[PDB]
Each structure stands twice: as structure tokens, then as C-alpha cells.
């Protein structure tokens, strides 16, 4: 399928460990009408490396912004170099295996990805009308305090 979008984002680890600290990984993200996939990027040759995972577009229920972290490290705090080193703008892709947290280098790039992702899931069956506006961190959602990753969203839209 045709490539709609191709960008380098920071990805928060999902099942690294149940209680261990959260890891953040630099990934090349690809969007087609069929899948949202991510790879280790091969910087030296200027091409995508090994595929590290995928999300079938049909399984996505929600795509929105996330309220940013209160104390972010320099890599996630607000040019050719800045675009591949700082990732301050998070968004969420909600599916069956909880939300995937993605960090964009710019506001414009996040907006573009949210816009296109909303169009590819337009005819999805499982789309929800509620979401969690804040991150799931240290066993709970910061917005509602619910302890289930698959918990129903606390806010409308
Ligand atoms: C990231 C890279 C090592 C293997 C692995 O297993 C789970 C995860 C993750 O959730 O990102 C990773
Ligand atoms: C990211 C999150 C889902 C599980 C997984 O396995 C490998 C990787 C990675 O290396 O990014 C991930
Ligand atoms: Mg630097
Ligand atoms: Zn919530």
C-alpha cells in the first residue's frame, strides 16, 4: 500500500516490564491505509532498518493529543538537528493492547499525523466517543486514576 506519512518519533515502551521504568525508543513510523508500523532507523544509509512492530489500522479506536509530562527530561522539552533530537509533543493511538504513546518533534507534525490517522480509521467499527486525555503512568491514568489500561475513557471526544 502507498505511504501516506513517514516520520522519526520517540516511542514509549509498552510491555518492557510490569513495574520497571519506562523506556523511550527512537523509531521511524510509517503510515499506510492498512498499517501503522515502526522500525529502528538506519541513519548511516538513510533508510528504514528492522521492523519492530505494527498496528493494523482496523484495530485503532481513537487517536488524540496527550497532556504533556510535568517534568520532562531534555530529550522531551521544548533546524536539521533539533527535529531528530527533541520530541516534546505527544499523541496517543488507542487500540486493543492499550494506548501507544508517540512523541513528535513539532506541533505541525503531530497535527498532520492526527489528521491523517483520523481519516484512515474513519470507517472503523470500534471507534469510541471517550478517551483518557492524560498518560497512563505508574499503574494508573493521571486524568481519572483508573487502574485498568483497557478502562473506558473519562472524557468525551
Ligand atoms: C523494545 C526493544 C527490546 C524488545 C522489547 O520488548 C518490548 C518492548 C517494548 O514494549 O517497546 C521492546
Ligand atoms: C514497541 C511496543 C510494542 C512491543 C514492541 O516490541 C518491540 C518494540 C520495539 O523495539 O520498539 C515494541
Ligand atoms: Mg544535541
Ligand atoms: Zn482518564
Swiss-Prot record:
Query: Which tissues is this chain's protein expressed in?
Result: Predominantly expressed in B-lymphocytes.
Q: For the region Inositol-(1,3,4,5)-tetrakisphosphate 1-binding, give the residue spans.
A: 11-23
Q: Where are the transmembrane segments?
A: none
Illness association:
X-linked agammaglobulinemia: Humoral immunodeficiency disease which results in developmental defects in the maturation pathway of B-cells. Affected boys have normal levels of pre-B-cells in their bone marrow but virtually no circulating mature B-lymphocytes. This results in a lack of immunoglobulins of all classes and leads to recurrent bacterial infections like otitis, conjunctivitis, dermatitis, sinusitis in the first few years of life, or even some patients present overwhelming sepsis or meningitis, resulting in death in a few hours. Growth hormone deficiency, isolated, 3, with agammaglobulinemia: An X-linked recessive disorder characterized by growth hormone deficiency, short stature, delayed bone age, agammaglobulinemia with markedly reduced numbers of B cells, and good response to treatment with growth hormone.
- Self-association or partners: how does it assemble? Part of a complex composed of EEIG1, TNFRSF11A/RANK, PLCG2, GAB2, TEC and BTK; complex formation increases in the presence of TNFSF11/RANKL. Binds GTF2I through the PH domain. Interacts with SH3BP5 via the SH3 domain. Interacts with IBTK via its PH domain. Interacts with ARID3A, CAV1, FASLG, PIN1, TLR8 and TLR9. Interacts with MPL/TPOR.
Function of the molecule: Non-receptor tyrosine kinase indispensable for B lymphocyte development, differentiation and signaling. Binding of antigen to the B-cell antigen receptor (BCR) triggers signaling that ultimately leads to B-cell activation. After BCR engagement and activation at the plasma membrane, phosphorylates PLCG2 at several sites, igniting the downstream signaling pathway through calcium mobilization, followed by activation of the protein kinase C (PKC) family members. PLCG2 phosphorylation is performed in close cooperation with the adapter protein B-cell linker protein BLNK.
Protein known as: Tyrosine-protein kinase BTK
Which source organism? Homo sapiens (Human)
Record gene name = BTK
Amino acid at each position: 500500500a502507498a505511504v501516506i506519512l513517514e516520520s522519526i518519533f520517540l516511542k514509549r515502551s509498552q510491555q518492557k516490564k510490569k513495574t520497571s521504568p519506562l523506556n523511550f525508543k527512537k523509531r521511524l513510523f510509517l503510515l499506510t491505509v492498512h498499517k501503522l508500523s515502526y522500525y529502528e532507523y538506519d541513519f548511516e544509509r538513510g533508510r528504514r532498518g528492522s521492523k519492530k512492530g505494527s498496528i493494523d489500522v482496523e484495530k485503532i479506536t481513537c487517536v488524540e493529543t496527550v497532556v504533556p509530562e510535568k517534568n520532562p527530561p531534555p530529550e522531551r522539552q521544548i533546524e536539521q538537528i533539533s527535529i531528530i533530537e527533541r520530541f516534546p509533543y505527544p499523541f496517543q493511538v488507542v487500540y486493543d493492547e492499550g494506548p501507544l504513546y508517540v512523541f513528535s518533534p513539532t506541533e505541525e507534525l503531530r497535527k498532520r499525523w492526527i489528521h491523517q490517522l483520523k481519516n484512515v480509521i474513519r470507517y472503523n467499527s470500534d471507534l469510541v466517543q471517550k478517551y483518557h486525555p492524560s498518560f497512563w503512568i505508574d499503574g494508573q491514568y493521571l486524568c481519572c486514576s483508573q487502574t485498568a489500561k483497557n478502562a473506558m475513557g473519562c472524557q468525551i471526544l
